[PDB]
Design a binder for this molecule. Structure first.
Ligand SMILES: C[C@H](c1c[nH]c2ccccc12)[C@@H]1OC(N)=NC1=O
Ligand SMILES: C[C@H](c1c[nH]c2ccccc12)[C@@H]1OC(N)=NC1=O
Lengths: 129, 134
């Protein structure tokens, strides 16, 4: 199989809850799993994302009681936000908005939404317009 | 410009310290910046990464005192680990360079990998695929 050049791996306090969030709310599918390690490799179109149940094999930068994901957001580029459940929700960190960003070679106009997953990871979907 | 389909954005407690880490230890370069916002868009080969000074415009899941990046690691695929300053012993190294086989969808991925821990605790995993056997 082909691995994307950038794949986030999210340790999940409750992998069942996280799996339901990513599959049912965000439309990811399970590509493969190592279920005996609580590990799931998810995909949606061209994006990939790994989930890992919190446990002894997890790579934890801070203590287990430290809330997850602070400071970061993952920007996923999508052709459209239509297949996302952006109902406006405790799952929504930033409601759908159109924003102009000044970038290297001009202005990137985007439609974007940010979700906050069950452990606090921020997942930003960006549609370039 | 072409935006990668997956780009992490890391809020940095000390943007100059983080910029020095990513550019000097990990070999990223600045593609462009928004200086007024403390924002930097970095690149290295096919990898892109965003850094932003902790401040008014930062998207923060938890309180500012909550340590950053817990639970996540970003896996960056690279052709080689050679250029990376993986030198030990270092507080920058979370997982020393190792070769590991992973069971994947259609076989086994044999990789060389190293995990860095950046100045705020974000884990950056560099993965060199040695082979995949079906
Ligand atoms: C807005 C930029 C961006 C990230 N991913 C994208 C996918 C399609 C089009 C644009 C983008 C980038 O993100 C932020 N926070 N500032 C930036 O310049
Ligand atoms: C090891 C896998 C992987 C992530 N990025 C890569 C780049 C090249 C070859 C393999 C990979 C993936 O990561 C983890 N933790 N388990 C997995 O199956």
């Amino acid at each position: 199989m082909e691995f994307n050049n950038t794949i986030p791996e999210l340790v999940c306090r409750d992998i069942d809850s996280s799996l339901s969030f990513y599959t049912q709310k965000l439309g990811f599918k399970v590509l493969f799993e190592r279920e005996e390690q609580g590990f799931f490799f998810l995909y949606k179109n061209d994006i990939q994302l790994m989930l890992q149940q919190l446990g002894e094999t997890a790579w934890m930068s801070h203590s287990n009681d430290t809330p997850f994901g602070n400071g970061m957001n993952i920007a996923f580029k999508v052709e459209s936000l239509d297949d996302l459940d952006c109902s406006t929700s405790e799952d929504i960190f930033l409601e759908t908005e159109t924003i102009e960003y000044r970038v290297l070679d001009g202005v990137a106009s985007v439609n974007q939404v940010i979700f906050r997953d069950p452990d606090g990871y921020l997942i930003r979907f960006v549609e370039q317009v």
